[PDB]
Design an enzyme around this catalytic site. Structure first.
Site, PDB file in Angstrom:
ATOM      1  NE  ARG C   1      -4.525  -0.545  -7.368  1.00 36.71           N
ATOM      2  CZ  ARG C   1      -5.340  -0.426  -8.146  1.00 36.71           C
ATOM      3  NH1 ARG C   1      -6.172   0.660  -7.974  1.00 36.71           N
ATOM      4  NH2 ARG C   1      -5.849  -0.995  -9.163  1.00 36.71           N
ATOM      5  CB  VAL C   2      -4.597   5.716  -1.156  1.00 36.00           C
ATOM      6  CG1 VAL C   2      -3.831   6.738   0.016  1.00 36.00           C
ATOM      7  CG2 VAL C   2      -3.441   6.036  -2.426  1.00 36.00           C
ATOM      8  N   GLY C   3      -6.699   3.881   0.463  1.00 31.99           N
ATOM      9  CA  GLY C   3      -7.443   3.508   1.540  1.00 31.99           C
ATOM     10  C   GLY C   3      -7.393   4.719   2.823  1.00 31.99           C
TER      11      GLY C   3
END
Lengths: 47, 215, 138, 131
Positions: C1-3
Site C-alpha cells: 500500500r505504501v508503494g
C-alpha cells in the site's frame, strides 16, 4: 517429342520453370505476391 | 470436492481456456485468408475438371487422402480416413498416398504395406500450386502405373460445415484414349502426356486449397 | 500500500518499467508452452518476461545495495539480456555485478549519490554492459 | 457466343464470359479459338493471350504455361500456372535474364541441366515479344 522430354523432364516441371521465369521478370510492386505463392513447404516421406 | 483439487482443476482449465481462445483466433485468421484464396482456386480447379464431365471418361480392366499434420480441428482427418478405408475395402489393386502426417498416422497401420508415399509440412503455411506439383512429380516418378485413382478431401461449404468428397484421377494417359475422346482430334498421343500431367497437378492443388479452408 | 512513497528515485527509474513488462508477461505467460505460432509482438513480451524473471532470482544471505540492484535491473530492462540465454542470466548478473563492484565503484557511488541514473552514468553503463556482454559470449 | 474461362491458380480473369475470340500460345503454334471451333486439347507455351472482347479494343495478357480446352459445347477454358497483364512486366529485367541463361547453357554438359536452362531461355525470350 520436346527437348525437355527424352532428357527426363516432364511438363509440370516445364510449367514450373516457365512460371518462375515470368515471376523473376516482374517489378517490385507486384513482386510481393510472388511470395504469397510458389511455396515449397511440402515434405516427402518415402519408406 | 477438495478445495485443493478444485483449485488444481481451475488452474489447468484457466490455461486451457487461454490457449484455446488463442488457437481460435489464429485459425479464424488463417481461415479468412484461406476462404478468399479459395475463390479463384475453385474456378481454376473446376476448370481443370472441365473436359471430363463435359465429356465422358470411364475405365477398362491410387487412393489419395488429403488433410494436414495438425489435429484439434474436429473430424477433418477422421472423415477422409473413414472414406479412405471404405474404398480400399470395396476394391483391382490397392495403393495409397497420404498428404498431411495425420493420414499417415490414422488410416495407417492396417495399411502401411499399402503405402507409396506420404507428405509432411502441410497446413501450417498456405498450400501452393508448387506443393501440388511436388505431389504430382513424386507420383509420376513412382513405379505405380496406376490405371485409375481417386482423391479424397474436405470440400468447404461454410464455417460450420464441410463434406468429404472424392474426385476421379483418370490420369491414365491410356484411359484418356477412349472412344469419347474421338470428338477431339489433332491430338498427338504425347500431347496428352503433357495435358494429363498438368491436369494432375491442378486436381491435387484444388483439393489442397479446399482442404485448408475446411481445416 | 505504501508503494513508491518509499522507493528511491534510482529504483523508480527502473522499477517502473519492470513492474509493467512483468504484468504484461503475466498476461501471456501461459501461452508460451503451446505458442506454436505467436506474433512477434507477444513473442517479445515472453522474452522480456523470462529474462526479467530471472533477474528477480536471488541466493540467500547476500542482500544487495540499492545501487547494485538498479545496475543489474537496468541491464535486462534496457534490453541488454534479451539476446542472452535464459539459462545464463543468473551467471551473467553474478559476474557482471562482480565486475562493477570491482572495477566500477565510482559509477555506483554516483548512482548512489545522485540518487538516480544521470544521462551520463546512463551512457557509461551502456558501454560497461555492451562490452562485458561481448566478453561474456566469447 | 462462347463461355470463356481464363485463370491461374491464384487469379481469375474470365469466368464464362461471352467473348468473340481468343488467341493462345501452344506447343504447336498459336491457335485462335473462335466462338465455334472444333473440339481440341492443347498444352501451353510461354507467350501471349489475346481476348477479343464483345466491344473492340482487345485486352492482352502474358502466360508462362498451362493448358487450354475447347469442348463439344462452345465452352473454352484457359489455365495458366501464371498469367499476368503486360502492365506489370519489366522489360529491362527479361533482357538481363535471357543473357544469364544463354551463359549458363554455354557452361552445361549435363543433358538434363541443359534442358532446364533451355526452357528458361525460351520463356525469358518470349518475354521480349509484347514488351
Amino acid at each position: 517429342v520436346a527437348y525437355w522430354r527424352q532428357a527426363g523432364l516432364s511438363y509440370i516441371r516445364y510449367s514450373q520453370i516457365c512460371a518462375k521465369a515470368v515471376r523473376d521478370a516482374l517489378k517490385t510492386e507486384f513482386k510481393a505476391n510472388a511470395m504469397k505463392t510458389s511455396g515449397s513447404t511440402i515434405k516427402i516421406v518415402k519408406v | 470436492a477438495t478445495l485443493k483439487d478444485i483449485t488444481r482443476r481451475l488452474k489447468s482449465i484457466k490455461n486451457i481456456q487461454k490457449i484455446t481462445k488463442s488457437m481460435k483466433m489464429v485459425a479464424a485468421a488463417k481461415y479468412a485468408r484461406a476462404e478468399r484464396e479459395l475463390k479463384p482456386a475453385r474456378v481454376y480447379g473446376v476448370g481443370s475438371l472441365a473436359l471430363y464431365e463435359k465429356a465422358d471418361i470411364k475405365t477398362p480392366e491410387l487412393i489419395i487422402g488429403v488433410s494436414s499434420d495438425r489435429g484439434l480441428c474436429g473430424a477433418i482427418h477422421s472423415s477422409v480416413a473413414k472414406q479412405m478405408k471404405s474404398e480400399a475395402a470395396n476394391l483391382k489393386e490397392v495403393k495409397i498416398i497420404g498428404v498431411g502426417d495425420k493420414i499417415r498416422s490414422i488410416l495407417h497401420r492396417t495399411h502401411s504395406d499399402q503405402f507409396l508415399v506420404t507428405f509432411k509440412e502441410v497446413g501450417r503455411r498456405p498450400p501452393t500450386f508448387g506443393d501440388a506439383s511436388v505431389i504430382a512429380l513424386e507420383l509420376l516418378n513412382s513405379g505405380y502405373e496406376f490405371d485409375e485413382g481417386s482423391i479424397i478431401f474436405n470440400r468447404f461449404r461454410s464455417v460450420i460445415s464441410y463434406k468429404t468428397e472424392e474426385k476421379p484421377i483418370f490420369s491414365l494417359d491410356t484411359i484418356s484414349s477412349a472412344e469419347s475422346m474421338s470428338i477431339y482430334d489433332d491430338i498427338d498421343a504425347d500431347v496428352l502426356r503433357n495435358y494429363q500431367e498438368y491436369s494432375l497437378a491442378n486436381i491435387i492443388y484444388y483439393s489442397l486449397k479446399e482442404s485448408t479452408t475446411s481445416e | 500500500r505504501v508503494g513508491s512513497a518509499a522507493q528511491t528515485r534510482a529504483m523508480k527509474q527502473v522499477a517502473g518499467t519492470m513492474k509493467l513488462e512483468l504484468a504484461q508477461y503475466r498476461e501471456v505467460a501461459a501461452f508460451a508452452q503451446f505458442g506454436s505460432d505467436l506474433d512477434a509482438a507477444t513473442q517479445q513480451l515472453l522474452s522480456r518476461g523470462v529474462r526479467l524473471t530471472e533477474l528477480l532470482k536471488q541466493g540467500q544471505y547476500s542482500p544487495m545495495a540499492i545501487e547494485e540492484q538498479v545496475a543489474v535491473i537496468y541491464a535486462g530492462v534496457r534490453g541488454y539480456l534479451d539476446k542472452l540465454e535464459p539459462s545464463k542470466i543468473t551467471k551473467f548478473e553474478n559476474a557482471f555485478l562482480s565486475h562493477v563492484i570491482s572495477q566500477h565503484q565510482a559509477l555506483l557511488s554516483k548512482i548512489r549519490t545522485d540518487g538516480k541514473i544521470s544521462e551520463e552514468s546512463d551512457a557509461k553503463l551502456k558501454e560497461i554492459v555492451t562490452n562485458f556482454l561481448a566478453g561474456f559470449e566469447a | 457466343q462462347m463461355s470463356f474461362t481464363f485463370a491461374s491458380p491464384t487469379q481469375v480473369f474470365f469466368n464464362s464470359a461471352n467473348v468473340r475470340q481468343v488467341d493462345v500460345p501452344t506447343q504447336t503454334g498459336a491457335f485462335g479459338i473462335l466462338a465455334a471451333h472444333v473440339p481440341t486439347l492443347q498444352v501451353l507455351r510461354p507467350g501471349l493471350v489475346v481476348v477479343h472482347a464483345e466491344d473492340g479494343t482487345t485486352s492482352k495478357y502474358f502466360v508462362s504455361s498451362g493448358s487450354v480446352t475447347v469442348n463439344a459445347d462452345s465452352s473454352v477454358q484457359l489455365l495458366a500456372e501464371e498469367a499476368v497483364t503486360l502492365d506489370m512486366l519489366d522489360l529491362g529485367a527479361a533482357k538481363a535474364n535471357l543473357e544469364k541463361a544463354q551463359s549458363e547453357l554455354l557452361g552445361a554438359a549435363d543433358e538434363a541441366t541443359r534442358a532446364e536452362i533451355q526452357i528458361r531461355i525460351e520463356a525469358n525470350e518470349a518475354l521480349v515479344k509484347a514488351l
